[PDB]
Amino acid sequence: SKTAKIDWSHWTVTVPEENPDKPGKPYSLGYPEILNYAEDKIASKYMYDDPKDKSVVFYAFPSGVTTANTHYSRSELRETMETGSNKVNWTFAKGGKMRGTYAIDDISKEPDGKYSRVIIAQIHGVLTDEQRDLIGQKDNNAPPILKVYWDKGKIRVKTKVLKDLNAPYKEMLSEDAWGDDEGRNFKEKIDLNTRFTLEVKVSDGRMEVILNDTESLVYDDIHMKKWGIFENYFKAGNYFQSKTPGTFAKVKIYSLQVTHL
């Protein structure tokens, strides 16, 4: 193939730029229009091919245009395990695996001289409509159970924990029941402009993140069991963690595969 190995039938993309037809909302593409990304006057500024190395570049920076439950700007893919639908998603018991080959192609520094941070992979929880209406929530939002960062030369992983292990079911369904863990870093430092692989393997009560097919960070305690109540989708690309004027990141993806065997 002349382009990166990404199955566009199973992703939507959202970019930093405002949709002209929808004020205040970021432009997005789903299937099949996402296949036209290289020729899309808006999207091609932020998701584009590098034919020299067969990558797709995700370029993001503070644009001031974000979505309702997301803080920073992004050029990022959202998994649709059924082509054309956002409402079909997977539980941890059903499981899922995502493999990606990435490089951090370029990134800004913050005013203190340290590099800006970028999230390159996520698992995002999502409520079913039945759960949303049971707790009377305005939307289907649920916590990001997994966030994988490039952070100052390391791959750093953040997961969520249930703050009150005695919380009842309806409380557990709300995002306020879930807090951040203390974070874990892989041992292998990952420099800029360096290809590396990530693999995320999810099964019943278990999440494993693997860097370069060597070290694994395994999450398999009560918090992963309690997380079983949610459905989920993968994300991959560039969720850029800065609002500092002039900052940016470019994340390259050479290969990206999701399975639910």
Question: Counting beta carbons within 10 angstroms of the beta carbon of residue 49, is it exposed (0 to 12), middle (13 to 18) or buried (19 or more)?
Answer: middle
Q: Resolution to 1 decimal, in Å?
A: 1.5
Q: Which residues of 112-141 are buried (b: 16+ CB within 10 A; e: fewer)?
A: eeebbbbbbbbbbbbbbeebbeeeeeeebb
Sign of CA dihedral 139, 140, 144, 150: negative
Closest to 141 measured CA to CA, from 180, 175, 167: 175
- Token pair 């199973």: residue: 10
Residue type, 132: R
CATH of the domain at 47: 2.60.120.200
SS3 letters across 45-85: HCEEEECCCCEEEEEECCCCCCCCCCCCCEEEEEECCCCCC
Place of tokens 């245009």: 65
- What determination technique applies here? X-ray
Residue 126 belongs to domain spanning: 5-259
The total of other beta-carbon atoms located within 10 Å of residue 66's CB is: 17
* CA–CA gap between residue 236 and residue 192 (Å, rounded): 18
State CA 150 to chain mean position distance: 12
Task: Show the CA angle centred on residue 63, arms to residues 57 and 67, nearest 5°.
Answer: 90
CA angle (84 as vertex; 19, 42 as ends), nearest 5:
25
Domain count, the chain: 1
Compute the CA torsion angle 79, 57, 114, 120 (nearest 10 deg): 10
CB atoms within 10 A of CB 71: 10
